[PDB]
Design a protein around this ligand. Structure first.
Ligand SMILES: *[C@H]1CC(=O)[C@@H](O)[C@@H](O)CCCCc2cc(OCOCC)cc(O)c2C(=O)O[C@@H](C)C1
Length: 346
């Protein structure tokens, strides 16, 4: 098999002339030439089978992406694995080769207002389809937003996604860890399992703020610091928003804090389009029930040049219920992964 950096990268003979590209979460990512379609592709190597939680993430991404088809979501072109469960140790997922991601871009490139508008439109157009499938992405951040050379945007990584479950979303104070820290909504730390669509809208708001200045808006230094950053800019929640939080440990924590004023967005972002700051404010609303939803966001004046509901499709086949992947041992999960990837043999 072909090696890359001393690791087996066993993809041939269809995919040749490998090049290292970066690191996934269960392994390496390489570019390669597809000798059938005659284009270069991205290939991520997955090694999940020693661990039940790794298998869960791998199965979840495969089941979702094999159902989804959308311009702003990076699909699965092919899956490579051994012909038998016994011999299958790794799984390689083949996707479109993109040019960069939003994390890498924001390190060095200032975005024009027109680019911010286009990127944000594409994120919301993809999110609309995801949410219409009754799916939460749950880890939206700049590095999961890929761009090609003409700035077409695609959403990466459904390994952390869940079927939405708003009726079972309430929980206790400081017990949940959903999403990546800087993009994690305040109610995660307060009283939410992250099972409602508003979790993703918060992350998008964080992404828009970062697009506006090239700096993460709420840069918490560790899990507990994050709420400090959110409240230091949003200010103290209203009585009405606190009356929304029935959990006493959460509400009393917030009540125990000194009053903090809201920092005006146009003071944080004096260069920004006023329509963008209005939409930003609506995505970064403290109360998740008041936070704007994906279809309202697409309709916001800021996006008026792009908005076209008939060109903003939804999912044919929404996921009706939870996958019920918890409790399944990893042996069962391997067999499910094997089964789900059979359609790409030989
Ligand atoms: C999506 C997630 C992602 O991009 C980040 O988690 C990233 O750090 C993972 C490793 C690199 C992914 C990547 C890099 C690319 O660079 C292209 O250079 C040659 C033009 C291109 C692509 O397409 C990807 C990519 O598809 O990714 C997916 C697999 C993961």
């Amino acid at each position: 098999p072909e090696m890359v950096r001393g690791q087996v990268f066993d993809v041939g003979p269809r995919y040749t002339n490998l090049s290292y590209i970066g690191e996934g979460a269960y392994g390496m990512v390489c570019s390669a030439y597809d000798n059938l379609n005659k284009v270069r592709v991205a290939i991520k190597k997955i090694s999940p089978f020693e661990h039940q939680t790794y298998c869960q993430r791998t199965l979840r991404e495969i089941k979702i992406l094999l159902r989804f088809r959308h311009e702003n979501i990076i699909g699965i072109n092919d899956i490579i694995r051994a012909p038998t469960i016994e011999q299958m140790k790794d799984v390689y997922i083949v996707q479109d080769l993109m040019e960069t991601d939003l994390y890498k871009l924001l390190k060095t490139q200032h975005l024009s207002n027109d680019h911010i508008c286009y990127f944000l439109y594409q994120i919301l157009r993809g999110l609309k389809y995801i949410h219409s499938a009754n799916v939460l992405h749950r880890d939206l951040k700049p590095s999961n937003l890929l761009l090609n050379t003409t700035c077409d945007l695609k959403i990466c990584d459904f390994g952390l996604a869940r079927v939405a479950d708003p009726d079972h979303d309430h929980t206790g104070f400081l017990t949940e860890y959903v999403a990546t820290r800087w993009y994690r909504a305040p109610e995660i730390m307060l009283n939410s399992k992250g099972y409602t669509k508003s979790i993703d809208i918060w992350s998008v708001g964080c992404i828009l703020a970062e697009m506006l200045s090239n700096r993460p808006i709420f840069p918490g230094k560790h899990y507990l610091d994050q709420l400090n950053h959110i409240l230091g800019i949003l200010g103290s929640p209203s009585q009405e928003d606190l009356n929304c939080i029935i959990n006493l440990k959460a509400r009393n924590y917030l009540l125990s804090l000194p009053h903090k004023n809201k920092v005006p967005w146009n003071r944080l972002f004096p260069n920004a389009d006023s329509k963008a700051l209005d939409l930003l404010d609506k995505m970064l609303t403290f109360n998740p029930h008041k936070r704007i939803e994906v279809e309202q966001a697409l309709a916001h004046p800021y996006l008026e040049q792009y908005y076209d509901p008939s060109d903003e499709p939804i999912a044919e086949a929404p996921f009706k219920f939870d996958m019920e992947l918890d409790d399944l041992p990893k042996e069962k999960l391997k067999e499910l992964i094997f089964e789900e990837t059979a359609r790409f043999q030989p």
